[PDB]
Structures are given as C-alpha cells and as structure tokens.
Design an enzyme around this catalytic site. Structure first.
Site, PDB file in Angstrom:
ATOM      1  N   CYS B 105       0.849  -1.202   0.000  1.00  0.00           N
ATOM      2  CA  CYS B 105       0.000   0.000   0.000  1.00  0.00           C
ATOM      3  C   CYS B 105       0.882   1.249   0.000  1.00  0.00           C
ATOM      4  O   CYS B 105       1.527   1.454  -1.045  1.00  0.00           O
ATOM      5  CB  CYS B 105      -1.037  -0.142   1.152  1.00  0.00           C
ATOM      6  SG  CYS B 105      -2.395   1.049   1.077  1.00  0.00           S
ATOM      7  N   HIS B 125      -0.284   1.377  -3.409  1.00  0.00           N
ATOM      8  CA  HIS B 125      -1.651   1.881  -3.539  1.00  0.00           C
ATOM      9  C   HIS B 125      -1.674   2.889  -4.674  1.00  0.00           C
ATOM     10  O   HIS B 125      -0.706   3.665  -4.821  1.00  0.00           O
ATOM     11  CB  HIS B 125      -2.093   2.590  -2.232  1.00  0.00           C
ATOM     12  CG  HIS B 125      -3.560   2.880  -2.214  1.00  0.00           C
ATOM     13  ND1 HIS B 125      -4.132   3.989  -2.837  1.00  0.00           N
ATOM     14  CD2 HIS B 125      -4.557   2.085  -1.685  1.00  0.00           C
ATOM     15  CE1 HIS B 125      -5.432   3.880  -2.661  1.00  0.00           C
ATOM     16  NE2 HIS B 125      -5.728   2.753  -1.979  1.00  0.00           N
TER      17      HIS B 125
END
Lengths: 187, 187
Positions: B105, B125
């Site tokens: 992420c 992400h």
C-alpha cells in the site's frame, strides 16, 4: 447523526475477522466501540495479535443501544461469546428492538448458543456448519455473505471485506459502501 | 527450521495491512515478530485499532536476521518508517544479504526513502504512486502483487491476503501457501 457499532472482542477471537470490520466501519463514518468481553485489558487473539479494546463490555453495554452488534469469529473467541451472560442479554435486547446483528466465521455459533434469530438463513465458516446446524434451528447457506432481515452472517477471513461492506450498506447505504470500497483495492 | 519474519509497526500503520500478513504468516508456521518502531508500547493504528507489539524494534533488530522484513502501509505509518534510521539499517542489511523485503500500500514508499531496491518493478496503492515514482527509480506496475526478485510489493487492504500468501510461497513454498489459503475462504 452517526450510526454506532459494538464489536465484542474475546480471547481467541480471529484478529482478521475483528480488525477488517472495525476499520471498514470507521472508514464509513460509523462510531465503533471495540469492547473487551472480559474487561478493558488487552486481548490475545487466535494468531497472537494483541488488541487493546476501547472499553470493557461492562461499560460499553451501558452506552447503547447500537445500530449493529458484531461478533467476530475464531473458535475459542466464539466459545467465549457463547458462554457469556452479558452477550446473551445484549443480543436478546438487540433482537427485541429489531437492530442488526452481524457475525462472521465461527461467530454465528454464538447466535445458536443464545437462541438468537432462529428460523433465519445463515452462513458460517465451513468447519462451523455442523455446530451451527445442531437442532436444525437455522437454514444453511454457502453464500459468502448472507442477510436474512436483521441477521447478517459471513464465512471467513477472506469474506471479511464483503461482510464489513454489507454492514456499511445496511447502516449507511449503498453509495457510502461503494465509496468506502474503491480505495480498498478489492478484487 | 522455521522461517522468521519481522513486521515493523509504527504509529499510523494500516491495521488491516498489518494484521492480515501477521496472521497468515503465523498460519504458515512462520515465526513472526511484530516489532514496535518506537518501543514496546501499544501502537495506535490509522483507524484507531491499538496493537501491542511483541517487542520493540530496538530489541527485535538484535535478534535477526530475518527471512523477510515486512512494511505495512498507512500513509502516516509509512512516513514514520521512512524517517527512521533503524529501519534504514535493517532494510540495507536485508538487501545486502539478499533477503526478502515485502511492502504493501503506502509501505513501499519507505523503500524509496531508504534507497532500497532501485531498478525494481513495484506496485503501491494508487494514491502512493506519485510519491513512489519521484525520480523514476522504480518501474511501476498495476498488478495486485508484484515481485521482482527480493522486492515484493502490493496495493492495498484488499490485496493483503494475496500479498501475505505471496510471502508464504516465497518462504515456505507453493504447497504450504495453497494449504493456508483454503481455510481462509478467499474469492
């Protein structure tokens, strides 16, 4: 007015089943109380993650009612939920006021223990099916998330995002669920 | 001989990105140390879940080396990882010994901060892409999990099971990953 969720956290709870719904509900603007069954002390989950609750269940129960009561899984956590008189009273009161009750993986077996929602279609983890179905008081489903009125159930860690988003949809609507879902990067 | 994982937990870490890999790695028989960046005290994660680490990072670093070093996401958690000299030394030592480094992420942005793995294909992400790509030191991917040799990256909470199972496959093999996956009830 924000919606409110009570997540009941017992020793042996599945930490994924616990954290994913807490986090996703908070992303949805729900006010979530992580309540320790046994008190305010940190809780050792099934895979040894240690989570500090926001409050004891004794205190959190005095602050309801809640728009959803959430029961994580983990076999030993669900057994602890099933043995608790406080959990029995919370769930009975939630059922009586027509409030949502949500349980995942082994969690729904605490509904059986407390005689909650009999006559509902439910799912569980596959390994919890026989326990849940003892006596034939529920109708079983293999759907990843099952909702039969006020009783919302799901199967496992790998269905926990779907479960959490179904709670969000039930409380805050489809558009909020879709908005919360996109930044999660789900399949 | 069991494999060992170090999970570095900082204030503001994404709790889903943290717990899902810890749990899934423990299901795989990996010995996981959840190490608090700032010390042994409980860590307040991005959505206010409070996790008690197994050890301080100061102590855990003296017990390595580890077969994988895992960096969760959460923007503020990744920023804390990026600012830490201890994290820099751990990752540099892991890279030098050709050990696996895994980040999810926003977590991979700490690799950039510490100049780790330049020239690798990575994912993050979507909202962390521009930060990760500043200077063009990596090649970007939109795969849910990306592995380019020793650098293993992934995108978000919703890719965390895939990420964790890729770590398990890397350390303990495909058969163990498949065995761990089935009881999770994944899509």
């Amino acid at each position: 007015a924000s919606k409110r969720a009570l997540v009941i956290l017992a020793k042996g709870a599945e930490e994924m089943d616990t954290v994913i719904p807490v986090d996703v509900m908070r992303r949805a603007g729900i006010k979530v109380t992580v309540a320790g069954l046994a008190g305010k002390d940190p809780v050792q989950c099934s895979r040894d993650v240690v989570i500090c609750p926001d409050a004891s269940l004794e205190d959190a129960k005095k602050e309801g009612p809640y728009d959803v009561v959430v029961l994580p899984g983990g076999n030993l956590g669900a057994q602890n939920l099933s043995e608790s008189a406080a959990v029995k009273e919370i769930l009975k009161e939630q059922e009586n006021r027509k409030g949502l009750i949500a349980a995942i993986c082994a969690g729904p077996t605490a509904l059986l223990a407390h005689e909650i929602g009999f006559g509902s279609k439910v799912t569980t983890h596959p390994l919890a099916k026989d326990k849940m179905m003892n006596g034939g008081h529920y109708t079983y489903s293999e759907n990843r998330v099952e909702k039969d009125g006020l009783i919302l159930t799901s199967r496992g860690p790998g269905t926990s995002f779907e479960f959490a988003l179904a709670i969000v949809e039930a409380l805050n609507g489809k558009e909020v669920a879709a908005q919360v879902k996109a930044p999660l990067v789900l399949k």
